[PDB]
């Protein structure tokens, strides 16, 4: 779930993906990438070979196991936009997220299935198409309910 790479110097790094990414769907966080290199010198230039110092190098190969970030337990995080209904005519279909089946009255509160159903005797905004997962799970859910 991580991408490793060398970036230019700075205090704010953006990260983007455009391969199906939303016009290159990107974010931008702050990250004080300042080159605190060893020795008196202050540049990224190996070529006149005089420098032989220790360096804390990032590993360039893939891992075997070093320490586990924990991904599991596919939850949701609060929304309002799961299912469809005109207040006693509810349509619940297959979905891209694990959508709980909620209504304003009756047994519609939950149920993370992608199963088609009509719903009466409930709420027009009261359809709680919930978030969940099955065979999924984020790391810690930082924004992430």
């Amino acid at each position: 779930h991580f991408i490793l790479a060398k970036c230019p110097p700075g205090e704010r790094i953006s990260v983007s993906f455009v391969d199906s990414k939303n016009e290159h769907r990107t974010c931008r966080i702050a990250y004080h990438h300042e080159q605190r290199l060893i020795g008196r010198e202050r540049f990224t230039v190996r070529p006149h070979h005089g420098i032989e110092l220790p360096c804390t190098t990032y590993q360039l190969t893939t891992a075997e196991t070093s320490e586990e970030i924990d991904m599991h337990m596919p939850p949701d995080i609060p929304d309002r936009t799961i299912l469809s209904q005109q207040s006693g005519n509810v349509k619940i279909t297959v979905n891209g997220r694990t959508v709980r089946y909620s209504s304003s009255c009756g047994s519609q509160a939950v149920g993370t299935t992608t199963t088609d159903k009509t719903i009466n005797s409930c709420t027009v905004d009261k359809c709680q198409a919930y978030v969940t997962s099955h065979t999924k799970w984020q790391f810690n859910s930082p924004f992430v309910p």
Epitope: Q85, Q86, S87, T118
Partner: antibody, heavy 117, light 110 residues
Amino acid sequence: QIQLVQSGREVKNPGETVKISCKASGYTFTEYPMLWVKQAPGKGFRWMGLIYTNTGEPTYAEEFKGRFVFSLEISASTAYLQINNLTNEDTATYFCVRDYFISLDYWGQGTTLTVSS
Amino acid sequence: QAVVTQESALTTSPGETVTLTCRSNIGAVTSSNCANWVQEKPDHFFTGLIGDTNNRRSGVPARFSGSLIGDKAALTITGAQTEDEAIYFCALWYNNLWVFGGGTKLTVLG
């Protein structure tokens, strides 16, 4: 569903709001939410909006937006599909309906208004 | 979001039925969409003869029933009795309104 009684034949001056009244009782007034009618005869199925308001989503339509604004004391399904900024072109049925059986299954009696300044 | 333009008379005879399909502009009228086709009456008629896109909706007789019919909310008026004249609204759903247009001239003879 929504047992809707409609408003009267309204008489509306120019620029005002003409609430097509609704006694949308017999069921939940949220169970039969604010399904507005703004139906002319040339319109047929005329825009006033739809709402089953059991969760609370009543909307004015394209015909219930601009000139329309859906309001109600909807506890007994008391409703006013208001011709808001209703000019001399305010003659239309501000009509009752309720969202249940996902179109206007429970329906109203209609409130046909003659708008004229 | 389509103004339901369709067969101009989606109506039948006395003992006769007319199965038209009034185009709400995306396709068939739906059930979670709530689009339909049915003879409702005039006079600010909050009553769906056929809504919910598989049969008659709430507030009308079920025989002038909604469908996903043709390219529209289908007004399959089977059971055109003596009182079968109305606005056969064939329109499409959006999950908030079965949007009809000017109405098919719904007829049951008699």
